Amino acid sequence: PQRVAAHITGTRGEKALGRKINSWESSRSGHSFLSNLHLRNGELVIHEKGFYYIYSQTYFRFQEEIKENTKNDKQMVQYIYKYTSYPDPILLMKSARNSCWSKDAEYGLYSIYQGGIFELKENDRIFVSVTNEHLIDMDHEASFFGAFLVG
């Protein structure tokens, strides 16, 4: 009960790159929980200041067809931002992958995971942003967002 951690998952649904994932939710059926943190507009809100190991896995998955009059190269990027007592969001972590360039490519499977420790104040907000949101697979075992006090 005095444990400070969170792991949230979803289901399909400004000043930051990409688009903010806001379809996260807390439910035991999707293996998600909140303990001394809460969820609001897709952001995890910090209660206790300290060092947090923050992480996210975003599953890019598509069954593409080389769309004629279109370049097909995809930049799949996951951004982890924090809103602190500053007007603009501050980027903490970013991880990227480019899709295979071959014309023979029939589909793509790109699970991106990153994590790191960042000091967070009380009432700081952390969120995940991604490019190509329409290719994200929101199955709870595939895409998630979490954090835990590491000091």
100 is in an annotated binding site: yes
Report the amino acid identity of residue 132: N
The pair of structure tokens assigned to 12 is 């399909």
Q: How many CA atoms lie within 13 A of 43 on its CB side?
A: 15
Distance from first CA to last CA of the chain, Å, rounded?
Answer: 17
| Measured CA distances, 42 to 102, 107, 126 (Å) | 36, 29, 9
The CA angle 34-37-42, to the nearest 5 degrees, is 80
Contact 91, 20 (CB under 8 A): no
Binding string, residues 69-88; x marks residues near a copy of itself by CB under 8 A: ----x-x-x-----------
Q: How many CA atoms lie within 13 A of 31 on its CB side?
A: 8
Examine residue 102 and tell whether it contacts another protein (CB under 8 A). no
Examine residue 105 and tell whether it contacts a copy of itself (CB under 8 A). yes
| Of residues 55, 79, 78, the one with CA closest to residue 6 | 55
Q: Which among another protein, a copy of itself, Cl ion, none contacts residue 7 (Cβ within 5 to 8 A by kind)?
A: a copy of itself
Q: Which among another protein, Cl ion, Zn ion, none contacts residue 85 (Cβ within 5 to 8 A by kind)?
A: another protein
Examine residue 100 and tell whether it contacts Zn ion (CB under 5 A). yes
Q: Kindly list the residues in this chain that would bind another protein in the complex (CB under 8 A).
A: 11-12, 17-18, 27-30, 61, 63, 68-71, 73-75, 77, 85-88, 90, 96, 98, 106-107, 109, 131-132, 137, 139-140
Binding site for a copy of itself (CB under 8 A): 2-7, 28, 31, 33, 35, 50-51, 53, 55, 57, 59, 61, 73, 75, 77, 91-98, 100-119, 139, 141-142, 144, 146, 148-151
